Symmetry: C3
Subunit: 101 residues, 3 copies
Amino acid sequence: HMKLITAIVKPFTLDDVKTSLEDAGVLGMTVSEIQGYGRYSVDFVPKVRIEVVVDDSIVDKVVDSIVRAARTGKIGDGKVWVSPVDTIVRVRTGERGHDAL
Amino acid sequence: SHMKLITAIVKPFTLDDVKTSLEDAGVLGMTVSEIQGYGRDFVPKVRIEVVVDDSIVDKVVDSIVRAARTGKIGDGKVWVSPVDTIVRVRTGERGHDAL
Amino acid sequence: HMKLITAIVKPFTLDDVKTSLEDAGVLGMTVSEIQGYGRQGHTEVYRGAEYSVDFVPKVRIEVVVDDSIVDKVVDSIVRAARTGKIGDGKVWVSPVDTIVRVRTGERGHDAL
Ligand SMILES: Nc1ncnc2c1ncn2[C@@H]1O[C@H](COP(=O)(O)OP(=O)(O)OP(=O)(O)O)[C@@H](O)[C@H]1O
Ligand SMILES: Nc1ncnc2c1ncn2[C@@H]1O[C@H](COP(=O)(O)OP(=O)(O)OP(=O)(O)O)[C@@H](O)[C@H]1O
Ligand SMILES: Nc1ncnc2c1ncn2[C@@H]1O[C@H](COP(=O)(O)OP(=O)(O)OP(=O)(O)O)[C@@H](O)[C@H]1O
Protein backbone atom coordinates (compact mmCIF):
# COMPACT_ATOMS: atom_id res chain seq x y z
CA HIS A 1 0.00 0.00 0.00
CA MET A 2 2.91 2.49 -0.01
CA LYS A 3 4.13 4.06 -3.27
CA LEU A 4 7.11 6.18 -4.30
CA ILE A 5 6.46 9.10 -6.64
CA THR A 6 9.42 10.48 -8.59
CA ALA A 7 9.08 13.76 -10.47
CA ILE A 8 11.68 15.16 -12.86
CA VAL A 9 10.84 18.85 -13.26
CA LYS A 10 12.17 22.29 -14.30
CA PRO A 11 13.92 23.93 -11.34
CA PHE A 12 11.71 27.05 -11.40
CA THR A 13 8.47 25.11 -10.84
CA LEU A 14 9.71 23.77 -7.49
CA ASP A 15 7.86 26.45 -5.51
CA ASP A 16 4.63 25.87 -7.46
CA VAL A 17 5.03 22.07 -7.07
CA LYS A 18 5.69 22.38 -3.31
CA THR A 19 2.47 24.39 -2.64
CA SER A 20 0.64 22.06 -5.02
CA LEU A 21 1.80 19.23 -2.74
CA GLU A 22 0.80 20.91 0.56
CA ASP A 23 -2.75 21.65 -0.86
CA ALA A 24 -3.00 17.94 -1.79
CA GLY A 25 -1.99 17.10 1.80
CA VAL A 26 1.56 15.77 1.26
CA LEU A 27 3.33 17.03 4.35
CA GLY A 28 6.96 16.66 3.12
CA MET A 29 9.19 15.49 0.27
CA THR A 30 12.82 15.08 -0.77
CA VAL A 31 14.51 17.14 -3.47
CA SER A 32 17.85 16.87 -5.29
CA GLU A 33 19.38 18.43 -8.39
CA ILE A 34 19.80 16.29 -11.52
CA GLN A 35 21.26 16.68 -15.05
CA GLY A 36 18.81 15.68 -17.72
CA TYR A 37 19.23 14.54 -21.29
CA GLY A 38 16.17 14.63 -23.60
CA ARG A 39 14.53 16.15 -26.67
CA TYR A 40 28.35 17.52 -18.67
CA SER A 41 27.89 18.38 -22.37
CA VAL A 42 25.52 20.94 -23.98
CA ASP A 43 22.75 18.34 -24.26
CA PHE A 44 22.48 18.12 -20.45
CA VAL A 45 20.06 20.52 -18.70
CA PRO A 46 19.53 21.06 -14.96
CA LYS A 47 16.34 19.58 -13.48
CA VAL A 48 15.16 18.78 -9.92
CA ARG A 49 14.18 15.31 -8.71
CA ILE A 50 11.25 15.41 -6.25
CA GLU A 51 10.55 12.10 -4.37
CA VAL A 52 7.47 11.66 -2.11
CA VAL A 53 6.48 8.34 -0.44
CA VAL A 54 2.63 8.26 -0.14
CA ASP A 55 -0.37 5.97 0.51
CA ASP A 56 -1.68 4.34 -2.70
CA SER A 57 -5.17 5.88 -2.17
CA ILE A 58 -3.71 9.34 -2.57
CA VAL A 59 -1.31 8.72 -5.50
CA ASP A 60 -3.37 9.89 -8.50
CA LYS A 61 -4.15 13.26 -6.86
CA VAL A 62 -0.51 13.78 -5.91
CA VAL A 63 0.81 12.78 -9.39
CA ASP A 64 -1.70 15.20 -10.99
CA SER A 65 -0.98 18.10 -8.60
CA ILE A 66 2.74 17.70 -9.51
CA VAL A 67 1.85 17.50 -13.24
CA ARG A 68 -0.41 20.55 -12.84
CA ALA A 69 2.26 22.80 -11.18
CA ALA A 70 5.20 21.53 -13.30
CA ARG A 71 3.43 22.26 -16.64
CA THR A 72 4.99 24.94 -18.90
CA GLY A 73 3.87 23.95 -22.40
CA LYS A 74 7.48 24.00 -23.62
CA ILE A 75 9.70 20.94 -24.18
CA GLY A 76 11.63 19.56 -21.24
CA ASP A 77 8.81 19.72 -18.65
CA GLY A 78 9.74 16.24 -17.48
CA LYS A 79 8.03 13.17 -16.11
CA VAL A 80 6.40 11.73 -12.99
CA TRP A 81 6.50 8.05 -12.32
CA VAL A 82 5.42 5.75 -9.52
CA SER A 83 6.98 2.57 -8.19
CA PRO A 84 6.27 0.19 -5.23
CA VAL A 85 7.44 0.53 -1.63
CA ASP A 86 7.39 -2.64 0.58
CA THR A 87 7.86 -0.83 3.93
CA ILE A 88 8.73 2.53 5.41
CA VAL A 89 10.10 3.14 8.98
CA ARG A 90 10.40 6.47 10.78
CA VAL A 91 13.87 6.46 12.33
CA ARG A 92 12.94 8.37 15.53
CA THR A 93 10.15 6.09 16.68
CA GLY A 94 9.98 2.90 14.67
CA GLU A 95 6.55 3.71 13.28
CA ARG A 96 5.82 1.69 10.17
CA GLY A 97 3.56 2.35 7.17
CA HIS A 98 1.24 5.39 7.08
CA ASP A 99 2.32 6.24 10.67
CA ALA A 100 5.89 6.75 9.31
CA LEU A 101 4.95 9.66 6.98
CA SER B 1 2.88 -2.75 -16.27
CA HIS B 2 5.61 -3.40 -18.73
CA MET B 3 7.75 -0.50 -17.51
CA LYS B 4 11.06 -0.78 -15.70
CA LEU B 5 13.59 1.59 -14.14
CA ILE B 6 17.27 1.05 -14.98
CA THR B 7 19.72 2.46 -12.36
CA ALA B 8 23.46 2.34 -13.25
CA ILE B 9 26.17 3.40 -10.80
CA VAL B 10 29.17 3.95 -13.10
CA LYS B 11 32.55 5.76 -13.24
CA PRO B 12 31.95 9.46 -14.23
CA PHE B 13 34.21 9.30 -17.29
CA THR B 14 32.16 6.50 -18.87
CA LEU B 15 29.09 8.74 -19.21
CA ASP B 16 29.48 9.84 -22.79
CA ASP B 17 30.30 6.33 -23.94
CA VAL B 18 27.08 5.39 -22.03
CA LYS B 19 25.02 8.29 -23.53
CA THR B 20 26.01 7.35 -27.14
CA SER B 21 25.50 3.60 -26.41
CA LEU B 22 21.95 4.44 -25.26
CA GLU B 23 20.98 6.38 -28.48
CA ASP B 24 22.06 3.30 -30.45
CA ALA B 25 19.66 1.14 -28.42
CA GLY B 26 16.94 3.71 -29.32
CA VAL B 27 16.86 5.14 -25.78
CA LEU B 28 16.92 8.93 -26.07
CA GLY B 29 16.63 10.70 -22.67
CA MET B 30 18.21 9.82 -19.29
CA THR B 31 18.44 11.37 -15.81
CA VAL B 32 21.96 11.78 -14.24
CA SER B 33 23.18 12.69 -10.72
CA GLU B 34 26.49 12.73 -8.85
CA ILE B 35 26.81 10.20 -6.01
CA GLN B 36 29.51 9.25 -3.52
CA GLY B 37 30.35 5.54 -3.76
CA TYR B 38 31.64 3.40 -0.90
CA GLY B 39 32.77 0.00 -2.23
CA ARG B 40 36.51 -0.80 -2.57
CA ASP B 41 36.85 7.02 1.70
CA PHE B 42 34.29 7.43 -1.07
CA VAL B 43 34.79 7.58 -4.81
CA PRO B 44 32.76 10.02 -6.99
CA LYS B 45 30.32 8.17 -9.33
CA VAL B 46 27.40 8.98 -11.67
CA ARG B 47 24.00 7.51 -11.23
CA ILE B 48 22.14 7.12 -14.49
CA GLU B 49 18.41 6.38 -14.33
CA VAL B 50 16.35 5.64 -17.38
CA VAL B 51 12.76 4.37 -17.56
CA VAL B 52 12.18 1.83 -20.37
CA ASP B 53 9.68 -0.71 -21.74
CA ASP B 54 10.40 -4.23 -20.55
CA SER B 55 10.72 -5.51 -24.19
CA ILE B 56 14.06 -3.70 -24.29
CA VAL B 57 15.30 -3.69 -20.62
CA ASP B 58 17.66 -6.63 -21.26
CA LYS B 59 19.40 -4.94 -24.28
CA VAL B 60 19.54 -1.53 -22.56
CA VAL B 61 21.18 -3.09 -19.47
CA ASP B 62 23.77 -4.83 -21.71
CA SER B 63 24.57 -1.69 -23.66
CA ILE B 64 25.15 0.22 -20.39
CA VAL B 65 27.42 -2.60 -19.10
CA ARG B 66 29.45 -2.61 -22.33
CA ALA B 67 29.99 1.15 -22.45
CA ALA B 68 30.84 1.32 -18.72
CA ARG B 69 33.31 -1.60 -18.46
CA THR B 70 37.01 -0.99 -18.11
CA GLY B 71 37.92 -4.29 -16.42
CA LYS B 72 39.31 -2.40 -13.42
CA ILE B 73 37.61 -2.66 -10.01
CA GLY B 74 34.85 -0.14 -9.14
CA ASP B 75 33.07 -0.32 -12.55
CA GLY B 76 29.75 -0.27 -10.69
CA LYS B 77 26.38 -1.95 -10.94
CA VAL B 78 23.25 -1.67 -13.03
CA TRP B 79 19.95 -2.71 -11.53
CA VAL B 80 16.30 -2.98 -12.68
CA SER B 81 13.15 -2.08 -10.70
CA PRO B 82 9.41 -1.95 -11.48
CA VAL B 83 7.73 1.25 -12.58
CA ASP B 84 3.95 1.09 -12.08
CA THR B 85 3.14 4.25 -13.99
CA ILE B 86 4.85 7.10 -15.84
CA VAL B 87 3.31 10.37 -17.19
CA ARG B 88 4.74 13.01 -19.58
CA VAL B 89 4.23 16.39 -17.79
CA ARG B 90 3.66 18.52 -20.90
CA THR B 91 1.01 16.31 -22.54
CA GLY B 92 -0.32 13.92 -19.86
CA GLU B 93 0.66 10.94 -22.05
CA ARG B 94 1.21 7.66 -20.23
CA GLY B 95 3.25 4.43 -20.48
CA HIS B 96 5.26 4.05 -23.71
CA ASP B 97 3.92 7.43 -24.98
CA ALA B 98 5.41 9.13 -21.86
CA LEU B 99 8.95 8.05 -22.86
CA HIS C 1 14.99 -11.53 -4.23
CA MET C 2 17.00 -8.34 -3.97
CA LYS C 3 15.73 -5.18 -2.28
CA LEU C 4 16.75 -1.55 -2.36
CA ILE C 5 16.96 0.11 1.03
CA THR C 6 16.63 3.93 1.00
CA ALA C 7 17.65 5.87 4.10
CA ILE C 8 17.10 9.62 4.48
CA VAL C 9 19.12 10.58 7.59
CA LYS C 10 21.03 13.45 9.24
CA PRO C 11 24.33 13.97 7.38
CA PHE C 12 26.34 13.66 10.65
CA THR C 13 25.15 10.08 11.36
CA LEU C 14 26.80 8.73 8.12
CA ASP C 15 29.89 7.30 9.92
CA ASP C 16 27.76 5.39 12.51
CA VAL C 17 25.44 4.20 9.70
CA LYS C 18 28.34 3.07 7.54
CA THR C 19 29.90 1.26 10.49
CA SER C 20 26.57 -0.32 11.50
CA LEU C 21 26.19 -1.61 7.93
CA GLU C 22 29.62 -3.25 7.67
CA ASP C 23 28.72 -5.05 10.95
CA ALA C 24 25.73 -6.54 9.10
CA GLY C 25 28.07 -7.82 6.32
CA VAL C 26 27.13 -5.04 3.90
CA LEU C 27 30.24 -3.88 1.99
CA GLY C 28 29.24 -0.99 -0.27
CA MET C 29 26.68 1.78 -0.32
CA THR C 30 25.60 4.65 -2.55
CA VAL C 31 25.34 8.12 -0.89
CA SER C 32 24.00 11.49 -2.24
CA GLU C 33 23.01 14.85 -0.76
CA ILE C 34 19.33 15.91 -0.65
CA GLN C 35 17.27 18.94 0.48
CA GLY C 36 14.61 17.55 2.80
CA TYR C 37 11.31 19.06 3.78
CA GLY C 38 8.98 17.98 6.57
CA ARG C 39 7.97 18.48 10.21
CA GLN C 40 11.50 19.93 10.60
CA GLY C 41 13.53 24.61 7.18
CA HIS C 42 16.82 25.01 9.06
CA THR C 43 19.15 27.83 10.22
CA GLU C 44 22.05 29.17 8.09
CA VAL C 45 24.80 31.72 8.43
CA TYR C 46 26.16 34.78 6.59
CA ARG C 47 29.16 36.65 8.00
CA GLY C 48 28.30 35.41 11.47
CA ALA C 49 24.56 36.35 11.26
CA GLU C 50 21.93 33.59 11.10
CA TYR C 51 18.93 33.22 8.80
CA SER C 52 16.18 30.72 8.11
CA VAL C 53 15.80 28.54 5.01
CA ASP C 54 12.94 26.16 4.01
CA PHE C 55 14.72 22.87 3.29
CA VAL C 56 17.05 20.90 5.51
CA PRO C 57 20.13 19.07 4.17
CA LYS C 58 19.90 15.27 4.54
CA VAL C 59 21.95 12.35 3.33
CA ARG C 60 20.34 9.71 1.05
CA ILE C 61 21.82 6.26 1.56
CA GLU C 62 21.14 3.41 -0.92
CA VAL C 63 21.95 -0.27 -0.37
CA VAL C 64 20.91 -3.28 -2.51
CA VAL C 65 20.63 -6.30 -0.21
CA ASP C 66 19.13 -9.83 -0.20
CA ASP C 67 15.62 -10.61 1.05
CA SER C 68 17.09 -12.46 4.09
CA ILE C 69 19.42 -9.72 5.40
CA VAL C 70 16.86 -6.90 4.73
CA ASP C 71 15.24 -6.63 8.20
CA LYS C 72 18.54 -6.70 10.10
CA VAL C 73 19.90 -3.98 7.80
CA VAL C 74 16.92 -1.60 8.10
CA ASP C 75 17.06 -1.98 11.92
CA SER C 76 20.82 -1.53 12.00
CA ILE C 77 20.45 1.77 10.01
CA VAL C 78 17.56 3.01 12.21
CA ARG C 79 19.60 2.41 15.46
CA ALA C 80 22.59 4.23 14.00
CA ALA C 81 20.70 7.29 12.62
CA ARG C 82 18.37 7.68 15.61
CA THR C 83 19.27 10.66 17.84
CA GLY C 84 16.12 11.29 19.85
CA LYS C 85 15.58 14.73 18.38
CA ILE C 86 13.24 15.44 15.42
CA GLY C 87 14.23 15.06 11.78
CA ASP C 88 16.05 11.72 12.15
CA GLY C 89 14.53 10.53 8.85
CA LYS C 90 13.13 7.44 7.27
CA VAL C 91 14.19 4.17 5.74
CA TRP C 92 12.10 2.40 3.14
CA VAL C 93 12.47 -0.88 1.18
CA SER C 94 11.59 -1.37 -2.54
CA PRO C 95 11.81 -4.21 -5.11
CA VAL C 96 14.82 -5.02 -7.30
CA ASP C 97 14.17 -7.31 -10.34
CA THR C 98 17.85 -7.89 -11.17
CA ILE C 99 21.30 -6.46 -10.40
CA VAL C 100 24.46 -7.04 -12.45
CA ARG C 101 28.15 -6.26 -11.68
CA VAL C 102 29.51 -4.10 -14.51
CA ARG C 103 32.99 -5.74 -14.63
CA THR C 104 32.07 -9.44 -14.44
CA GLY C 105 28.44 -9.64 -15.53
CA GLU C 106 27.73 -11.44 -12.25
CA ARG C 107 24.06 -11.39 -11.48
CA GLY C 108 22.09 -11.59 -8.22
CA HIS C 109 23.83 -12.01 -4.87
CA ASP C 110 27.01 -12.61 -6.86
CA ALA C 111 26.74 -8.96 -8.08
CA LEU C 112 26.88 -7.44 -4.56
N1 LIG D 1 13.56 7.53 -20.45
C1 LIG D 1 13.75 8.48 -19.50
N2 LIG D 1 13.86 8.10 -18.21
C2 LIG D 1 14.06 8.97 -17.20
N3 LIG D 1 14.15 10.29 -17.38
C3 LIG D 1 14.06 10.83 -18.60
C4 LIG D 1 13.84 9.95 -19.78
N4 LIG D 1 13.77 10.78 -20.85
C5 LIG D 1 13.92 12.05 -20.41
N5 LIG D 1 14.10 12.08 -19.06
C6 LIG D 1 14.27 13.27 -18.18
O1 LIG D 1 13.23 14.18 -18.54
C7 LIG D 1 13.79 15.45 -18.83
C8 LIG D 1 13.01 16.02 -19.98
O2 LIG D 1 13.07 15.05 -21.03
P1 LIG D 1 12.50 15.49 -22.46
O3 LIG D 1 13.30 16.70 -22.92
O4 LIG D 1 12.45 14.23 -23.29
O5 LIG D 1 11.08 16.11 -22.01
P2 LIG D 1 9.68 15.40 -21.68
O6 LIG D 1 8.87 16.34 -20.83
O7 LIG D 1 9.74 13.93 -21.28
O8 LIG D 1 9.02 15.46 -23.15
P3 LIG D 1 8.72 16.90 -23.81
O9 LIG D 1 10.00 17.68 -23.55
O10 LIG D 1 8.49 16.49 -25.25
O11 LIG D 1 7.50 17.46 -23.10
C9 LIG D 1 15.21 15.15 -19.27
O12 LIG D 1 16.09 16.30 -19.23
C10 LIG D 1 15.57 14.02 -18.34
O13 LIG D 1 15.87 14.58 -17.06
N1 LIG E 1 25.01 -3.04 -2.06
C1 LIG E 1 25.18 -1.93 -2.81
N2 LIG E 1 24.10 -1.20 -3.17
C2 LIG E 1 24.19 -0.12 -3.94
N3 LIG E 1 25.36 0.36 -4.41
C3 LIG E 1 26.52 -0.27 -4.10
C4 LIG E 1 26.52 -1.47 -3.27
N4 LIG E 1 27.81 -1.87 -3.17
C5 LIG E 1 28.56 -0.99 -3.87
N5 LIG E 1 27.78 -0.04 -4.42
C6 LIG E 1 28.17 1.08 -5.28
O1 LIG E 1 28.91 0.47 -6.31
C7 LIG E 1 30.16 1.15 -6.51
C8 LIG E 1 31.24 0.15 -6.92
O2 LIG E 1 31.16 -0.90 -5.95
P1 LIG E 1 32.42 -1.82 -5.53
O3 LIG E 1 33.71 -1.08 -5.86
O4 LIG E 1 32.07 -2.50 -4.25
O5 LIG E 1 32.41 -3.08 -6.55
P2 LIG E 1 31.88 -3.05 -8.08
O6 LIG E 1 32.52 -1.92 -8.86
O7 LIG E 1 30.39 -3.30 -8.05
O8 LIG E 1 32.56 -4.42 -8.61
P3 LIG E 1 34.16 -4.66 -8.73
O9 LIG E 1 34.77 -3.72 -7.72
O10 LIG E 1 34.22 -6.10 -8.29
O11 LIG E 1 34.51 -4.26 -10.14
C9 LIG E 1 30.44 1.81 -5.16
O12 LIG E 1 31.28 2.96 -5.32
C10 LIG E 1 29.06 2.13 -4.62
O13 LIG E 1 28.60 3.35 -5.20
N1 LIG F 1 6.53 11.82 2.20
C1 LIG F 1 7.88 11.86 2.12
N2 LIG F 1 8.50 11.32 1.04
C2 LIG F 1 9.84 11.33 0.92
N3 LIG F 1 10.65 11.86 1.85
C3 LIG F 1 10.18 12.47 2.98
C4 LIG F 1 8.74 12.50 3.19
N4 LIG F 1 8.56 13.13 4.37
C5 LIG F 1 9.77 13.46 4.88
N5 LIG F 1 10.74 13.07 4.03
C6 LIG F 1 12.19 13.23 4.22
O1 LIG F 1 12.53 12.81 5.53
C7 LIG F 1 13.03 13.95 6.28
C8 LIG F 1 12.52 13.97 7.72
O2 LIG F 1 11.13 14.32 7.68
P1 LIG F 1 10.30 14.94 8.95
O3 LIG F 1 10.79 16.38 9.10
O4 LIG F 1 8.82 14.68 8.76
O5 LIG F 1 10.89 14.14 10.22
P2 LIG F 1 10.89 12.55 10.53
O6 LIG F 1 12.23 12.10 11.07
O7 LIG F 1 10.22 11.81 9.42
O8 LIG F 1 9.87 12.56 11.78
P3 LIG F 1 10.20 13.20 13.22
O9 LIG F 1 10.67 14.61 12.87
O10 LIG F 1 8.84 13.14 13.90
O11 LIG F 1 11.20 12.24 13.84
C9 LIG F 1 12.70 15.20 5.44
O12 LIG F 1 13.65 16.27 5.61
C10 LIG F 1 12.70 14.65 4.02
O13 LIG F 1 14.05 14.47 3.51
